[PDB]
Symmetry: C4
Subunit: 175 residues, 4 copies
């Protein structure tokens, strides 16, 4: 049983546009921020909104920082054959580079997600504040092909280090 | 006889959207996954669909991996003057990096191809499962300018090493 | 109070498309050319128009040079939740790499800004000549969420070095 | 007199879509292939069409190679304020890397140019065969702001080395 037929028809048997919560856990060896997207030129973009002071001392009430979700590999051009777990790999370039389970408790930010598709031209949006990002969680599978949307928003806790990627790299140079 | 006149008209004399099979063989010194596309803003994208377990032990029922087909050079923006052989160069970044003629026998994957063009906005799709990807094959030419579509799907076997690109690089470090 | 609700609605309470002047000052440790943008697929592009002679001796009456404003990070794909300060980081790749407060006094150039968005397809444009680019200035904040558009065009002077980025790097190699 | 007013209107005073010939000469220290474009989301793309045999011995009747004309800098997103000289910088990545005035005499290729713009969605095309690419030529200026379209297609010869970029680099390693 293939997911897509030779002529292009999809063989997937199906409030469910974006998961209510986002999560941060390990996947393929990298601390990753993840959230789920349900349902031509379907592209996704993420911005991190936050108040901050530049080293120059300037206070930016609402600054927007980019959150890489496929822009450099084309992974942001989505094939919505079924629910997708969008991944933001936290690295030195990420605004979450020094975000730890601890700091999250006091952090204040808003991850805005923008999904655009098609002529049809539409825009779906969502937002994840710090309290809606769950450290140490992982999404339940939804594909069984059948999709169980009752598990769309569900996540569970898994063994995840509390330190940020920056702290992980620091502890490595020494050890 | 030019292929395109000064004013832009094409001088090509013409179920034929995508070749029924894909192939893997050498071209310009690189192991390459190839398939043919027949017929504004005409762009092509490829996703590799497959079930896999992350090193974290998580099982992803249907994960989508990117398959580079011109995204970084602009080669994915197609000029459909006639049938085109789309090329995915298998390198360290490719999900097929360690795919060999042997492993293919037991592998399970699905290459999904998405072609979008134009206002017109349309989407053509296709799919290639492991059994529809022929190792050691090459496509017959279709351009003679006249296009012989009876050879569109035809491929023939050519001397091709059975090892994966990863194995090729390993055998090189030592030898 | 979040900026964007879970369903995507924006919670911002609002001649105001582009700031009348642009500025050049330090932000996050980099000399930056900045201007403000007010109000799908909303993208911004900047071109530097100027007359110049190539080392070959050829005079180009009106040559267009690129001005990086997010093209390589996706920051040029705008989320117009409120007024945005567009940033062009002046580096070795920038046409303003050797622009100093001094040279500006004799320079002659025109920064053209092109904003495109959406179906809707529209184009807003503006222009900043050398006399409309203020060295040593910074924009006043407009977000308080409420936006005070009376401060949209307002800027004030701040302690800024008069030397160009190229001169900064030169003085560093030696010192 | 600015080229563009604060509100975006252009101050330019105007068979003229593409120059009949292309040229290859030095500009800003680089051997460059150039051609002129006259007249939203206005983007240009170039493909090099040619018959060739792969080292594997395979003959490709009509292979398409990419010709970089701004794809990596955004310079391919055009601002048609007046006639533009499109530039393809010949480097190690260019299909013209080893093209010399000599080889051109026997070469056989076709540079296809594709211009797309906007809703409006249109496509203008053109083609330049080897005999329509003039080595050692430069375009006359058209901007004086007034545009003299009688000089649109005009080019003149200038002192240009006959060797290819590859040969230039070879002669450098030794000398
Ligand atoms: Na479009
Ligand atoms: Na890119
Ligand atoms: Na890049
Ligand atoms: Na449209």
């Amino acid at each position: 049983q293939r997911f897509v037929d030779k002529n292009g028809r999809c063989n997937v048997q199906h409030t469910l546009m974006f998961s209510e919560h986002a999560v941060i856990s390990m996947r393929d060896g990298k601390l990753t921020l993840m959230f789920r997207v349900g349902n031509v030129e379907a592209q996704i973009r993420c911005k991190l909104l936050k108040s901050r002071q530049t080293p120059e001392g300037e206070f930016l009430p609402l600054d927007q920082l980019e959150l890489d979700v496929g822009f450099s590999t084309g992974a942001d051009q989505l094939f919505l054959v079924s629910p997708l777990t969008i991944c933001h790999v936290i690295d030195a370039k990420s605004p979450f580079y020094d975000l730890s389970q601890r700091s999250m408790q006091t952090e204040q930010f808003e991850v805005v997600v923008i999904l655009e598709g098609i002529g049809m031209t539409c825009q779906a949006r969502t937002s994840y504040t710090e309290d809606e990002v769950l450290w140490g969680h992982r999404f339940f599978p939804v594909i069984s092909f059948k999709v169980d949307y009752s598990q769309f928003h569900a996540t569970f806790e898994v063994p995840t280090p509390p330190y940020s990627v920056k702290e992980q790299e620091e502890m490595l140079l020494m050890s």
